């Protein structure tokens, strides 16, 4: 095993978080499509795809380091019952994810695994972009009203 | 809830099987790429993508029937340690999957859910194609020898 | 030095107004984008760019007239806290800007600097178009309601 | 408010440096064009545009972190009176800017704001490329002589 | 001079490793071509080219920092006598060379040379990709057998 | 082994000369680029690339003849401190290189290795073209003066 054992543990923890997000965002996407809120459904689908790509890169890095990627343990999905709950639940997940990313980066730096650190910083930038999106949507609900906000997400771009 | 309760249970069971296959095939794909067996890695990636598409269609059908798609419960991945074990483990998973598909189809027919039956028959045809592929690969190992078989899967098409 | 000294003072005053407007509109643009009101953010960015182009022409004219362009003194930015305040603040700024432009044109005419007058008249036409836009947006808020007005500016 | 308060102070300090550089380089550009040294004018315009783009990214990051971008305080422009002074003034400004960038990156690292650190590192790479350019121009003046150096920058 | 003296020493040490790798990989490439293992010859040629490009970037950074690039001291090449030995020798070089890159990055971080650190991190990612390639080839020899492995590298 | 042992010694001597020139010309190129003499930098880069191609052909020929190419022993680089020293150092190196080429050709002819002779004659033609270029550049410094000569090599 060529990589640092705790680095591999951290990468598997980030991978676990991405696996939760893949499933939660994919279900939320399809719930929004089922309700006819196709613009939200499409955007949330692309969020799910982006998490899938991050998970791929984490799996490839873990194998290069001769660790074992853990795709078996799936943590808790928090599926909302309406749009505001779904957005907030995504946001709560992202805030936990960025906490775990920052701890992983600290450890990669300490053991000089600079390539793993760069991979995680790239993922972190993407997750912060997702936080930006989510906070913006919740703010729009307040500025334009829920009924208008949902109306604006019926039809795709 | 507009759909038959047991139909929705069956669709969630098939969905559960697809979720196992997504992860097992994706990891097997990336293990083969890590070993430099890129033709196997590419083929197994496309198998994983195909299971993702089946899972999407099952989720959409469950929501239309006003059921709750279960993306939370992930069953047992059986990750092989070498090519022959990985192929056999995929094959064992597919044989369980087709058993469950046939039971689901029997029940859809009994309660006259002909659209759900057609969706499952489409998935079943794809899974039998995957069995065809897997049985063929294991037979090739015997006909050309393991070392030649692996050699033939180093470079992509 | 070929230029009239008071013409150069006037041109530097107009330049100072443009420099305030560049920064106020740019910040308002990025606030609207942060809030997800991308159509307002995009329009306000283009207003900021237009002020940048006016400032460029003023700098070039001042240098031709052998004056010293003043980019050092930045007057008061009035940043609003919500859409209605941001639009009204831009409008208040534009009304001050057009007052100064008219006084500058009067002086250019008196000392026969007709090319500077023509430059300032082109800038004034642009600033009056911006007043038109701002008064129209504030009127639309009254006609369609605030929530609908904001909704119509979410998407570009 | 998600952002670290001292990170936002640092980002506003870097923003303040960019705002000085935007105006100093833009004026230097238009001075060089007025003098007929169009190749210097064009290059310096592009330096001003690059600083504008950095300021934009800083404003956007500050707003994401729920801070208040400061476009109101404009520090000291040091406008040169001839080409050699203008280049050295830009270089003095860039050396101050890189010192502040390094101090900002240290603090971002300490509080684990790695995305802000990455933004500042990209800006720092751009500012060090500008130092490279400036040191090269000042060296060329010594190697080819001032008159030849200016001659080579008449035409674009 | 602007650069930290130990940073420049570290960059010259990395440059020295790249210069060994250029020549070792180029000779290994031409040995594989002479033996008719053209797929290995072509891949190894591209590894040598990639090291040449890294060397270029390091030379440019050393000169910007006002250090003296050292292309005179060439360290020890380890030339294999068959395919297995050549791949092992490349891997030995890469493992020793990535250790030096990590030590250089630690020092850049300590003295706040973040641009040098970023350059070395880009090179390090490339060298780890080469380690990935080399370990994979040695594993394929085990999995498919040496004769099949070489057969698969006859044709481009 | 098919090759004449002294032919292989001569080919390895010529290869050693090319390896010196690759590194000397590459560093001179990057020094000229650092100084903003980009036309000299580009031309010198191309000279380095041409020596790389000659080295490749020599390596291939040695391996065909069942000799061992020597990429380990790197002779003395003579790096100039300014343009006139750099050009003269390149010229001195080329004059040594052509002396060795002629002695290698004499020996190839004596032992009837006409294909090695032809390869060396093709290299010699390229090195004489480089001598032509270098002598011309030193002559231009005298004819147009150093400051004008350097000015003419600022822009590509
Ligand atoms: C281990 C977890 C997963 C990984 C690593 C993963 C990876 C990927 C990747 C790399 C792609 C290609 C994206 C692109 O290049 O644009 C993809 C596509 C896709 N994935 Fe996933 N995925 C995972 C789980 C899932 C799940 C659980 C679902 C749905 C329930 C899903 C649904 C999809 C769909 C619908 C596509 C697009 C298929 C198409 O091209 O038609 N994925 N996935
Ligand atoms: C807060 C301060 C400023 C910011 C954030 C800013 C930002 C920008 C940005 C992002 C662009 C587009 C650049 C590109 O994408 O190529 C731009 C264009 C430009 N800016 Fe600024 N700018 C600022 C101040 C100024 C000032 C004070 C002036 C002149 C006195 C100026 C002159 C220009 C010009 C001439 C253009 C090109 C317009 C065109 O496309 O015709 N900027 N600015
Ligand atoms: C044994 C020594 C070397 C050999 C045989 C060699 C050979 C080559 C060859 C054949 C090329 C392709 C040229 C073409 O076809 O146009 C090349 C490219 C190049 N070489 Fe070398 N080289 C050597 C050492 C070096 C060194 C020491 C440096 C710099 C320190 C260097 C820098 C470059 C660069 C920058 C390129 C262009 C690569 C690109 O942009 O794709 N090389 N070399
Ligand atoms: K509405
Ligand atoms: K075979
Ligand atoms: Na519905
Ligand atoms: Na936001
Ligand atoms: Na079959
Ligand atoms: Na109006
Ligand atoms: Na320089
Ligand atoms: Na491997
Ligand atoms: Na000549």
Short mmCIF file of C-alpha atoms in Angstrom, two decimals, chain C residues 5-6 9 15 41 66 112 127 148:
data_model
loop_
_atom_site.label_atom_id
_atom_site.label_comp_id
_atom_site.label_asym_id
_atom_site.label_seq_id
_atom_site.Cartn_x
_atom_site.Cartn_y
_atom_site.Cartn_z
CA UNK C 5 -8.30 75.77 -17.82
CA UNK C 6 -11.94 75.86 -16.73
CA UNK C 9 -11.83 71.53 -14.60
CA UNK C 15 -14.70 62.24 -15.20
CA UNK C 41 -26.89 41.95 -12.91
CA UNK C 66 -2.75 69.27 -22.12
CA UNK C 112 -15.77 78.05 -28.33
CA UNK C 127 -26.93 59.38 -19.38
CA UNK C 148 -43.21 39.92 -10.12
#
